[PDB]
């Protein structure tokens, strides 16, 4: 009952381990339906049991690799390895490495600063209108903190040096930094052993692997001109449209016919597909290659254009409410947004208003006409008169 037991102050690192949820999501098991890529049937929707926080620390490193394609458009490949037996994951990318040099203000080598100190980022100057997913200066450190071993290797031909250093025990200590002369092709490679005890797991099991493999497919579908490999296996995705087809290729509507898909690449920062849903409103969307699984104003901005036009039509031919049109829709959106905001570090819901996007996404009259003719108007029209 002492005042010192009751009222306690935590360090930032202590707080992350004590209160992980707002940083990485739940550290308890969840059982829910998800899209996964299974070793035998591929992309499919099924019940899975997994720990969100474990999935998220993988996501943080993977999105960081996609971010390097905006930093260096000459980057060409991402290679992911997953080794359940040794509890080992690595994510490698080419294109420009991280500068191997001492930071004159923070007085340590740049790779050690930005992987080993909290609140460090190249995304803190919003006069730079960037379409990277990184915003807060946490993600890589969060992966470090929830790993028993975390290694950073990055090679910079500009500085003619390669950097390598390892952290251990939830970012509680580090081994010696290794510097070596370098004159080859730049790359960065992050290799980590997740702290499965913090997630109450015994190994990287079937479900979490299938989620991680699907997330790699996401990256292959949402990035431009980046080849993605998983354990050496090239992921056979060319464009966002071919990614979308993996979800639809084989299912038919409840009446029995194949799904009609409306598509437009609106500009270099927006691509949209629309089909029908039998499960209520559904959206699969990405902002700067982040999976925005709770949606956000980018989904609203696109979906509302469609809804308003379809509601206009049923009025001409008739009382109809927006939510009734929306619950027939399955929308896919791939967007590049300048300096996005989200509700949380996990970046599931993108909250930035359209006036700040840095681009527009006005669907064409052709897209809209095809949406009017996809059957939603007819279904609702028959409903109202009845």
Ligand X SMILES: CCCc1cc(=O)oc2c(C(=O)N3CCCc4ccccc43)c(OCCN3CCN(C)CC3)ccc12
109 vs 332, beta carbon nearer ligand X: 332
Handedness of CA 302, 303, 306, 312 (dihedral sign): negative
> Pick from Cl ion, a copy of itself, ligand X, none: which does 353 bind, CB < 5 to 8 A by kind?
a copy of itself
- For residue 378, the minimal CB distance to Mg ion (Å) is 44
- Tell whether residue 341 is a contact of ligand ANP (CB under 6 A): no
Question: Mask of contacts with ligand ANP, 128-157, x by CB under 6 A?
Answer: ------xxxxxxxx----------------
Q: Is 197 annotated as a binding residue?
A: no
- For residue 29, the minimal CB distance to ligand X (Å) is 12
Round to whole Å and give the CA distance between 115 and 57.
13
Interface pick for ligand X out of 293, 305, 327, 349 (rule CB under 6 A): 293
Q: Is 81 annotated as a binding residue?
A: no
Looking at the DSSP assignment, which residues form a beta bridge with residue 7?
A: none
Secondary structure of residue 260 in the 3-state scheme: coil
Sole window of 218-226, 230-238, 255-263, 272-280 interacting with a copy of itself (rule: CB under 8 A): 272-280
| H/E run at residue 68 | helix 52-71
Interface pick for a copy of itself out of 39, 85, 104, 173 (rule CB under 8 A): 104
Interface pick for ligand ANP out of 16, 65, 204, 335 (rule CB under 6 A): 65
Round to whole Å and give the CA distance between 212 and 86.
16
Contacting Cl ion within 309-348 (CB under 5 A): 342-344, 348
- For residue 64, the minimal CB distance to a copy of itself (Å) is 14
- For residue 134, the minimal CB distance to ligand X (Å) is 17
> Pick from ligand X, Mg ion, Cl ion, none: which does 282 bind, CB < 5 to 8 A by kind?
ligand X
- For residue 47, the minimal CB distance to ligand X (Å) is 11
- Residue 70 exposure: Cα atoms within 13 Å on the Cβ side: 22
Round to whole Å and give the CA distance between 341 and 351.
5
186 vs 207, beta carbon nearer ligand ANP: 186
Question: Which residue in 351, 303, 336 sits closest to 129, CA to CA?
Answer: 336
Token pair, residue 66, equals: 């996609």
Residues 6+ apart with CB under 8 A from 227: 76, 77, 78, 220, 234, 235
Looking at the DSSP assignment, which residues form a beta bridge with residue 295?
A: 349
Question: Mask of contacts with ligand X, 184-223, x by CB under 6 A?
Answer: -------------------------------x--x-----
- For residue 322, the minimal CB distance to ligand X (Å) is 9
Distances (CA, A) of 42 to 46, 65, 80, 104: 12, 24, 18, 49
Handedness of CA 148, 209, 238, 33 (dihedral sign): negative
Q: Is 123 annotated as a binding residue?
A: yes
- Tell whether residue 291 is a contact of ligand X (CB under 6 A): yes
Question: Which residue in 120, 126, 90 sits closest to 105, CA to CA?
Answer: 120
Task: Please count the other Cβ atoms lying within 10 Å of the Cβ belonging to residue 118.
Answer: 15
Q: Is 265 annotated as a binding residue?
A: no
Residues 6+ apart with CB under 8 A from 72: 95, 96
Q: Is 44 annotated as a binding residue?
A: no
Size of the site for ligand X (CB under 6 A): 15
> Pick from Mg ion, a copy of itself, ligand X, none: which does 134 bind, CB < 5 to 8 A by kind?
Mg ion
- Tell whether residue 346 is a contact of Mg ion (CB under 5 A): no
- DSSP code of residue 124: -
Interface pick for a copy of itself out of 77, 88, 101, 259 (rule CB under 8 A): 101
Residues 6+ apart with CB under 8 A from 234: 227, 228
Interface pick for a copy of itself out of 122, 166, 170, 265 (rule CB under 8 A): 122
Contacting ligand X within 212-271 (CB under 6 A): 215, 218
Secondary structure of residue 1 in the 3-state scheme: coil
- Which residues contribute to the site for Mg ion (CB under 5 A)? 64, 134, 139
Residues of the shown chain interacting with ligand ANP in the complex, contacts defined by CB under 6 A: 60, 64-65, 68, 93, 98, 114, 120-123, 134-141, 188
Q: Which residues are annotated as a binding site for ATP?
A: 64, 93, 121-123, 134-141, 345-347
């Amino acid at each position: 009952a002492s005042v010192e037991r009751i009222y306690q102050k935590k360090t930032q690192l202590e707080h992350i381990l004590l209160r992980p949820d707002t940083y990485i999501g739940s550290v308890e098991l969840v059982t829910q339906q998800m899209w996964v890529y299974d070793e035998d049937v591929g992309i499919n929707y099924r019940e899975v049991t997994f720990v969100p926080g474990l999935y998220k620390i993988f996501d943080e490193i993977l999105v960081n690799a996609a971010d390097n394609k905006q930093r260096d458009p000459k980057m060409s490949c991402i290679r992911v390895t997953i080794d359940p037996e040794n509890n080992l994951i690595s994510i490698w990318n080419n294109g420009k490495g991280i500068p191997v040099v001492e930071h004159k203000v923070e007085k340590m080598y740049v790779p050690a600063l930005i992987f080993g100190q909290l609140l460090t980022s190249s995304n803190y100057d919003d006069d730079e209108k960037k379409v990277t997913g990184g915003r807060n200066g946490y993600g890589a450190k969060l992966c470090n903190i929830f790993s028993t071993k975390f290694t950073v290797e990055t090679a910079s031909r500009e500085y003619k040096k390669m950097f390598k250093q390892t952290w251990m025990d939830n970012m509680g200590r580090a081994g010696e930094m290794e510097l070596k002369p370098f004159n080859g092709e730049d790359y960065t490679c992050i290799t980590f052993q997740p702290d499965l005890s913090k997630f109450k797991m015994q190994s990287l099991d079937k479900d979490i692997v299938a989620l991680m493999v699907r997330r790699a497919y996401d990256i292959a579908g949402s990035t431009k001109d980046v080849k993605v490999f998983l354990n050496g296996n090239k992921l056979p995705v060319k464009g966002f449209r071919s990614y979308v087809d993996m979800y639809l290729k084989d299912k038919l509507d409840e009446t029995g016919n194949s799904l009609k898909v409306i598509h437009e690449q609106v500009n270099h920062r927006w691509e949209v597909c629309l089909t029908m849903s039998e499960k209520g409103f559904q959206q699969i969307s990405f902002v700067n290659s982040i999976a925005t699984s709770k949606g956000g104003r980018h989904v609203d901005y696109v979906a509302d254009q469609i809804v308003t036009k379809l509601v206009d039509v049923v009025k001409k031919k008739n009382a109809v409410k927006a939510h009734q049109v929306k619950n027939h829709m399955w929308i896919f959106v791939n967007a590049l947004i300048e300096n996005p905001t989200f509700d949380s570090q996990t970046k599931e819901n993108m909250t930035l208003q359209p006036k700040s996007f840095g681009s527009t996404c006005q669907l064409s009259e052709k897209f809209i006409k095809a949406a009017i003719g996809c059957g939603i108007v007819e279904s609702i029209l028959n409903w109202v008169k009845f």
